[PDB]
Amino acid sequence: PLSILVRNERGHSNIYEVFLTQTVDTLKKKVSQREQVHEDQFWLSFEGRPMEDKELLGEYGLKPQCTVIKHLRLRG
């Protein structure tokens, strides 16, 4: 049970709890509910690598207090 930051589209970080044995979509769902934004409207990267829905969180080299970046899908 790791604590991390997800930096939002405004450049501001928010603390999320995460399990390395769980897939990336678990964190998508946490961000989606807390920041009021549909899952298919954003993606996450970590150290410049895109995170993928069915990849385990532990495969990305996550650490306590590390930062994931949220990327809005921009459409207009």
Place this chain on the structure above:
Amino acid sequence: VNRLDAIVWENIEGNLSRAFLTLDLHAFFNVNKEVGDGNCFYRALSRLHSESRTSNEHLYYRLLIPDAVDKYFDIEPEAIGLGLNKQEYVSKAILDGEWAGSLEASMLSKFLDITIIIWIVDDSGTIISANRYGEGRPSQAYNLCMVGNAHFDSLYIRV
């Protein structure tokens, strides 16, 4: 102009770099408002690619997408990030009025060898961030204004 070219962008991923800053939009650019027909993204590229300043190539710019997909979609962080299906995406993206933005900026910046910057504006019309797709400076870039997270207008850099 002078100021915008002094911005050091932060590299993030692929050819995407980013800036956090507040600007008065009208002080730095003139805006040509685009119509609400689903095509603003491609209208703005058409308008910005040429001094005659017309959006009537918008269909042509849209028709670049299948070819850019062949070249790049397999490697676009956003497509990968969102787990998009290639064939699903290409079929929708070519339809009249289908919205576009960050993914097509990423593909086309590369495909045409240009720099596209989407400047993000809050409720009050203040630029609050920007995404730059490419390595060029803003004075040379295709500058777009993103409004209400649902529309783009074209920006002409002011002098």
